[PDB]
Design a protein around this ligand. Structure first.
Ligand SMILES: CCO[C@@H](Cc1ccc(OCCn2c3ccccc3c3ccccc32)cc1)C(=O)O
Lengths: 265, 258
């Protein structure tokens, strides 16, 4: 009972491998930090303006009002995430061989669904790890920021809490993330079929990977695919929120790379 | 256990055939002409509608066209909700769930099922109407007023892609059941039995596809991702209904409260 299964495991290993090489902060590490293990250090916790302030010292993170400072923080980290995801996509067999326009298109629409997915790896009901895991910002501090900014994270936490319920590990994510990138239903693709063939193979690999890694958790495959609905809505609420800041913060600059992704859509 | 899954599949199918008079198999027969017996009356332009309103009885008439057409789509939806409701009752486990959860699962699942089955009565040029007696063109629909001109366009968008999967009634019966037993509907009181049931339905669906479409074993996954396509359309629709909520009897408003 090991026919084409071999091919699929091989692909799984390949992606898991690229994933480790493309993302310095994996779920496994973020968990060792959040559950107080001994393989990792403990984070500094920001829960208020006061705490935040000592955090500048204690943490330091490559960086006028607090809300905007934090907002500018996510942008920089998001930009970095895009770089990592772009580097990971290139390792997906067949991706770099597709039409360049479509490669740009798949990344344009796939990058955020992947950022929030992976962002769940650094979250628990109470907060989120920051500065490569050196810090932890509580859900509450974030939910209290100035009128518009404090509404950015709550829906991510809500998704994270439900998504983490599936209890997936980095090896599962590597494939699932690869499925998201290769979506032949993205607006403006010029050559859908090639893209779909790849995703089809990825899907078979993820299906096998979920049965083998979570034998007791039946229909995990079915439940995970359904999670896409949550992702799309997160993206939507987010862009609208961005529209608001753009008209209320005329002195604020949205990172060019982010402007290009968010552009048309 | 495979035999139990096939049994569940036959049961849902037999029940589907009894709750939905106009099946996909029948509909496809009418759309391709495989049944020249009774071809449908076409409604391509303003003039034909007027004539069709005379030919076909249409039980939704009491004069601005665009609205009349909409009230028709609503009347049919209310009927569809009763059919779906009778079908759900036959899904093993459903009636044993808490009553409030039954109502909840139906309340949030009828739209998804309606548009799913609507795909069955459509092709790129139009949708079959009034029990198959008619056929309203896609172009005629597009060419409607402001808030109405883009009411159905989204459904046709979905329909063409959904019909690409080439599913038949026995596949749909299981798929529809899966959509009903969704454990993530807001306000549920006892999620465990719901997901337990969906679990079994997905197993039955997975086997049904592999047997009924041996030459395309990724179909299950593809079918599942179409479920998210459905939720988006339901979002766009309720949203549009608000742009319509902007006006367009009080006893009638009660019947179509939703
Ligand atoms: C601000 C615009 O939001 C982004 C999306 C986005 C939103 C929130 C978000 O939360 C993470 C914040 N975040 C930080 C915030 C301040 C300082 C460091 C980090 C940090 C370090 C490592 C990892 C994460 C980190 C990460 C990305 C976009 O629109 O592309």
């Amino acid at each position: 009972l090991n026919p084409e299964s071999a091919d699929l495991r091989a692909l799984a290993k390949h992606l898991y491998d690229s994933y480790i090489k493309s993302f310095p902060l994996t779920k496994a590490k973020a968990r060792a930090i959040l559950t107080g293990k001994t393989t990792d250090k403990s984070p500094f916790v920001i829960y208020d303006m006061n705490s935040l302030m000592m955090g500048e010292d204690k943490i330091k993170f490559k960086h006028k009002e607090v809300a905007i400072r934090i907002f500018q923080g996510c942008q920089f980290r998001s930009v970095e995430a895009v770089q990592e995801i772009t580097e990971y996509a290139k390792s997906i067999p067949g991706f770099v061989n597709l039409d360049l326009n479509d490669q740009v298109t798949l990344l344009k629409y796939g990058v955020h669904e992947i950022i929030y997915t992976m962002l769940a790896s650094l979250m628990n009901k109470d907060g989120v790890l920051i500065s490569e895991g050196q810090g932890f910002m509580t859900r509450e501090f974030l939910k209290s920021l100035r009128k518009p900014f404090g509404d950015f994270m709550e829906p991510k936490f809500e998704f994270a809490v439900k998504f983490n319920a599936l209890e997936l590990d980095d090896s599962d994510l590597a494939i699932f993330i690869a499925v998201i990138i290769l979506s032949g239903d993205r607006p403006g693709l010029l050559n859908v079929k090639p893209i779909e063939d790849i995703q089809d193979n990825l899907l078979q690999a993820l299906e096998l990977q979920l049965k083998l890694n979570h034998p007791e958790s039946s229909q995990l495959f079915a439940k995970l695919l359904q999670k896409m609905t949550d992702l799309r809505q997160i993206v939507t609420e987010h862009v609208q929120l961005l529209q608001v800041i753009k008209k209320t913060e005329t002195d604020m600059s949205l990172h060019p790379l982010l402007q290009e992704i968010y552009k048309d859509l």
